[PDB]
Scaffold this active site. Sequence first.
Site, PDB file in Angstrom:
ATOM      1  N   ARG A   1     -15.029  -3.333  13.872  1.00 24.40           N
ATOM      2  CA  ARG A   1     -16.019  -4.414  13.093  1.00 24.40           C
ATOM      3  C   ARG A   1     -17.231  -4.566  13.095  1.00 24.40           C
ATOM      4  O   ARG A   1     -18.003  -3.830  12.633  1.00 24.40           O
ATOM      5  CB  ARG A   1     -15.797  -4.824  11.822  1.00 24.40           C
ATOM      6  CG  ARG A   1     -14.327  -5.074  10.936  1.00 24.40           C
ATOM      7  CD  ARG A   1     -13.559  -5.623  10.115  1.00 24.40           C
ATOM      8  NE  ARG A   1     -12.999  -5.630   9.305  1.00 24.40           N
ATOM      9  CZ  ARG A   1     -11.970  -6.192   8.712  1.00 24.40           C
ATOM     10  NH1 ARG A   1     -11.371  -7.094   8.874  1.00 24.40           N
ATOM     11  NH2 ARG A   1     -11.533  -5.983   7.390  1.00 24.40           N
TER      12      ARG A   1
ATOM     13  N   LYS B   1       7.265   1.610  -2.183  1.00 24.60           N
ATOM     14  CA  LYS B   1       7.805   1.068  -3.527  1.00 24.60           C
ATOM     15  C   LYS B   1       7.028   2.027  -4.403  1.00 24.60           C
ATOM     16  O   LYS B   1       6.006   1.869  -4.319  1.00 24.60           O
ATOM     17  CB  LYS B   1       7.837   0.023  -3.723  1.00 24.60           C
ATOM     18  CG  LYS B   1       9.028  -1.075  -3.572  1.00 24.60           C
ATOM     19  CD  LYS B   1      10.119  -1.025  -3.825  1.00 24.60           C
ATOM     20  CE  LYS B   1      11.305  -1.657  -2.469  1.00 24.60           C
ATOM     21  NZ  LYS B   1      12.263  -0.887  -2.747  1.00 24.60           N
TER      22      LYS B   1
ATOM     23  N   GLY C   1      -3.444   0.113   5.763  1.00 22.80           N
ATOM     24  CA  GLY C   1      -3.138  -0.472   7.106  1.00 22.80           C
ATOM     25  C   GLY C   1      -2.048   0.237   7.985  1.00 22.80           C
ATOM     26  O   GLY C   1      -2.326   0.454   8.896  1.00 22.80           O
TER      27      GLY C   1
ATOM     28  N   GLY D   1      -8.708  -3.829   0.946  1.00 22.97           N
ATOM     29  CA  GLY D   1      -8.521  -4.212   0.044  1.00 22.97           C
ATOM     30  C   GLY D   1      -9.304  -3.366  -1.357  1.00 22.97           C
ATOM     31  O   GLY D   1     -10.307  -3.626  -2.295  1.00 22.97           O
TER      32      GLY D   1
END
Length: 395
Positions: free
Chosen positions: A40, A196, A352, A375
Amino acid sequence: VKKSVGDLHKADLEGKRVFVRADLNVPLDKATLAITDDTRIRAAVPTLKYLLDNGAKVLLTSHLGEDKYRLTPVVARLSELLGKPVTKVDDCIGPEVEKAVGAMKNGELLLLENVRFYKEEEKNEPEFAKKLAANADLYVNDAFGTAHRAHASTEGVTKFLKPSVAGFLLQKELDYLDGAVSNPKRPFVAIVGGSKVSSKITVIEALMEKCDKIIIGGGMIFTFYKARGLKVGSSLVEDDKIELAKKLEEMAKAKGVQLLLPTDVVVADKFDANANTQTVPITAIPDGWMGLDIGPDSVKTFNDALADAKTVVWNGPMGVFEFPKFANGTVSIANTLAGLTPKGCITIIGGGDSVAAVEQAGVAEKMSHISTGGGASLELLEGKVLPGVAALDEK
């Protein structure tokens, strides 16, 4: 659509006090506070170097942490990767900042203390944003990972600084996650994996508006198969998402999307890297066994489908790649994309587990773009608008 820091030239920058919101929230070792991944920070330096080299006086802000840290642990790494010294100030507002800013020369960088020590930061309170802007002339947002939040440093301050523009890192994230997807070069293949289908609905639905083919992998395939009336052994399924699985298949056909699911799977008699295994067609899953990877026939089918792609977006592993016996699905796909990038194809990774997958598959530097903000990546690939981006000036 949004102005960039690159759209400004030295006349706009030399001598100016430039408030920069960066994402310096690097993982820290709990015991030593050493940086375990400085990606980062490295991603942040091109915006900073451009500003400093054009004579700006940079006021740099970030968070580091729901537990907050002072920015001490990043000062030295930032200076090393910047190639310029870094002066720390123990506040982000007030007279101490004003004093430090007054003593600055052109081409110098100040690092303000963690803005989230003020509760007003996450409340986006205007009087606090006002105090943040009080010692700045203009604003650069380079913090894509927080662009979906409306905080003082990421949104509120833009009401007091003109211009407000996107840094190079934020612009790259938008160029790949928004531009490259919305106006894609074709064939455009999306790859979505996960345990899922509930967690992946909106990204799947968003990608069907744009892509030519969708490859579906991971444990969520077994709810699709159960929706066909097939047995799925002990594979975990979401019975409440069976009807949703049928709708996605229908929606694919209506929109002209080739939906690709595996035709064979590697099944295990328990969730264990040491399990017994079989490779079976998806129409003959043995009772009490669970699917932990896609099979070799499906790997070949998926590779063939990708072989002429010009854009690929990949979010989610094809199987339990942490288990060597069940890794071939993810590693093969990762390395197919790695071979597409040098041939002109735009390869974009998000999530991730997909980034842990490309590291384990040895292709982490071999893509066009790997998204730095998890996110925010999903919400942009979702088609919803980020408050941090909308606040910036139009080009």
